[PDB]
Symmetry: T
Subunit: 91 residues, 12 copies
Amino acid sequence: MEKQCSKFIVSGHVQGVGFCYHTSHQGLKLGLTGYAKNLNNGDVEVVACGTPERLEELYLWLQEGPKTASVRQVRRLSSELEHDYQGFEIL
Amino acid sequence: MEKQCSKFIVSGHVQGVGFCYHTSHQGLKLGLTGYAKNLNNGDVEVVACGTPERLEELYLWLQEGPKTASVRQVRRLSSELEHDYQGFEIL
Amino acid sequence: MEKQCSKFIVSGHVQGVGFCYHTSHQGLKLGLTGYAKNLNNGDVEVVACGTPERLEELYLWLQEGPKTASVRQVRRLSSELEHDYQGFEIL
Amino acid sequence: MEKQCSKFIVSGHVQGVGFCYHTSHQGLKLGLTGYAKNLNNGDVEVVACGTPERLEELYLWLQEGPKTASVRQVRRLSSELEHDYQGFEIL
Amino acid sequence: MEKQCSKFIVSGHVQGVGFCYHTSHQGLKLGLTGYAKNLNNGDVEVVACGTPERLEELYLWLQEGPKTASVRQVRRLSSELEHDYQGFEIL
Amino acid sequence: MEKQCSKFIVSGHVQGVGFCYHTSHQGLKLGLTGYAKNLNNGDVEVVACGTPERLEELYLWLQEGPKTASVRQVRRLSSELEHDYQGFEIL
Amino acid sequence: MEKQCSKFIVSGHVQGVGFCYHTSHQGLKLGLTGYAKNLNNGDVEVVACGTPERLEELYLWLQEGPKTASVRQVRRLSSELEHDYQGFEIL
Amino acid sequence: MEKQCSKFIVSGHVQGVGFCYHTSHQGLKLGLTGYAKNLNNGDVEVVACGTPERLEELYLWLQEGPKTASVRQVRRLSSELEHDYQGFEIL
Amino acid sequence: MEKQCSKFIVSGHVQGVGFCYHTSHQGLKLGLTGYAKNLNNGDVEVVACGTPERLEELYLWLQEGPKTASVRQVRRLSSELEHDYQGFEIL
Amino acid sequence: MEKQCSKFIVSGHVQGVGFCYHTSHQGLKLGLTGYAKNLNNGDVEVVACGTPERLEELYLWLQEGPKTASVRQVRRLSSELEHDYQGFEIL
Amino acid sequence: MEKQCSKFIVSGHVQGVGFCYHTSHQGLKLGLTGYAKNLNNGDVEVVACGTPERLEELYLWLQEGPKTASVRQVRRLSSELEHDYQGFEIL
Amino acid sequence: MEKQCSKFIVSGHVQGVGFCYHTSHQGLKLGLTGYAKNLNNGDVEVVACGTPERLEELYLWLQEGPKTASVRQVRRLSSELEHDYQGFEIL
């Protein structure tokens, strides 16, 4: 099995609207691990680790997937993370 | 960011059929906090806290949302609760 | 494997004399789940869930089972709750 | 030491303003145990167990003590509670 | 309410792809208890306890329910388990 | 002291009737450690570690000791466990 | 309720034989709090807090009550501690 | 019922002197949530969420309120945080 | 920073009156670590670790700081502790 | 990064001699995840997930790495395990 | 599998220098249980339980084993402890 | 006992190879506190607190000490951190 970590920066009406919980829930259904972190500027930083295919699935969900939040942008950032995160924690 | 609390009395075949867990899950996907409490008479008392729009979203889900429990009635009660509930616990 | 819940009201000198602990211990030995809850009028509300035969055993112990407390009366009240509690905790 | 429990019904703007946390803190400083409970009507039910002298001190604090909340009224109710609560929880 | 337990053996690509989490979440929405266990041969052993209808509902989900995992076969095995599990654990 | 571990297989109506809890409670009063595991075929696997005198005493309790469960047969099977378990858990 | 604390020094074969657990259990059934500490010389220190009548009942159990340990002597020592211990811990 | 988050940077001798604990305690008495974070340059970053009047109160306390720490300056920086923190933790 | 540990013996009516909790709270506001232990002779043993100035600060509060307890004497005893305790526990 | 799991069956004087704790410690230094389970026959089942090189390092350590246990044999079993194990736990 | 307990009094520069952690770690690698307790006079009290061979092994490590602390003396004291300590705790 | 804090930025192949676990373990044997944090660029941020002598000892270990990770550079950064961290966490 292959494994890599990707960082996503999500912006819009994404805080206090269940986005971190839903993203965590969605990621765990994909066998992904990482975290959803609330940034001070009102963004949410999503880090996910797993096969590139499942990450692609999550990236697509962050954009299109049915959710309470109003996602305006999802920017895929370069990441050199190879750390094993336990579960999908809300930060 | 406006926050208010609403109380819902759900009646029907609604205990021991995953309704409390599902209500909790749905409320957290909405960014809501509160609890789902099992009453002695077979009803489930749901208290949810958040913006009125998200509360209308939960109230609608309690009625029509796809679930295992057989909901017969969902009654909206007055509440002056302004307490910050942590998460969405099953009681 | 039929399972139901029953509510018991125990009156007398039954608070602060180890009754709630002993009751929950007795219930767990009967394979029951529920709670022992101290009421403001000095009574103790005992909710237990399991097969009717076990619930009959618990009632019998509540009345004349060897204990510290002085039980003047045990009354079984109606209950329609079908929720599955975890263990037997004190409230 | 002798030990008894007292119930207080605090009314006014007392929820979501750090009242339950402050009450529990003030209770523990008095060597008291019990709980502070948020009621649906906006009131806060305060139960405290300890010496009559310390309960009186808590009664006075609930009425006049410097706090964020604006207390409208503190009603003292009779209680037959003789149960030992661990610490001073908020519910 | 009636209670029985059923064992399931799921084969295919079902490990490290969120199947255990998703199954657990699915069972909890059905009001089921038990566990999802990872076996050395690549399979996942699912034990679920509840009413026969709910167990049939989960059995159907394991086969055709929308999931990340690719399920080859869902073998249903006999079980005499009458133990009460807490929640739906991943092993 | 000289500890050893013994494995016991108990058959009959011994699951969901407080047997695992009671066994662990009894074992802890004997100063024993280990666990009680529920098996798929309805049996209960009891593992206990301690001095042989205590293990014999536990064996006799599993057979004749006043309990809720209906014990058909208790079989001490071979064990080469030398691991130190903490407390007496239920599996 | 009147609350007193008593100190007991128990000598004999009382360590590693389920004595601390059984004492703790027995104390909790009496509505007592405190602890049972294992001493380097092989003795067991038992501190218990509650009503004088219940303390006398525990003092009797330590002496005569059926247990695994072989109690040699039970010396009741004076105690001025009026601290509220949570539960009945083994130390 | 109107909530917002404010970010404060506190400078001076403010680390290792009980400031983070005291701030959280004070904030919790105000009915606020958030965190007190220790920065590498010796500053303490305080984030608090609640009604503006309470955040005013906290700011004033950070400056003048009786404390062990020696505060040289307090600056409220911008924040678009709309996440709901639980309690008031130290980082 | 320069850290040392000090031991204090507090005598009088200092148990079961919230002294240990309050002392713990006070020490944590001073940025101190250690414990408050209830002694059998009615005394309370307070061990606190931090800078000397804060330890002088604590000693002064132990004597005349507004508290529930009635302190008749505070004695500082020798200590060569250099262990880092976590928080301020009650023993 | 690529990831895979391997199962090791360790036989010898390997139980109750710190082998499980040391294997766990060693595996975590290699950045591996999995478990060390004590088997009834006196063996220890080691499952470790990570890069193939890290696994070979652990395999080598199991065979001849300095340890308290007297390892007689280390058998490498085929495994289709692809589950994310958290940490390196003892079972 | 026999088991006894031994007490070691370690004097020197042995507090706040990782000695309690390292001793705990070493003892767990030896399959031992017990504790490392910081004494008020600067010494560290070490109690370990297991086979005499392993206890001799720890005793030697306390004296010569590579460590951060500057151990000046290790006193082997008599003990009648037969209590099953869980893990190797730092006190 | 004097204590200060230092920041280290370690680069190379240092994530997912037990570096954070090993570092924290090594710091605790030195009697240090702080954390090991995984950065997005592949680096690991190490903050350690304690006596200057021990900090240099850890600094040297980061460079030369036997470890799984392949360390390119260890850059020491200035720090005014005076906060007391509990243990040695991985972030």
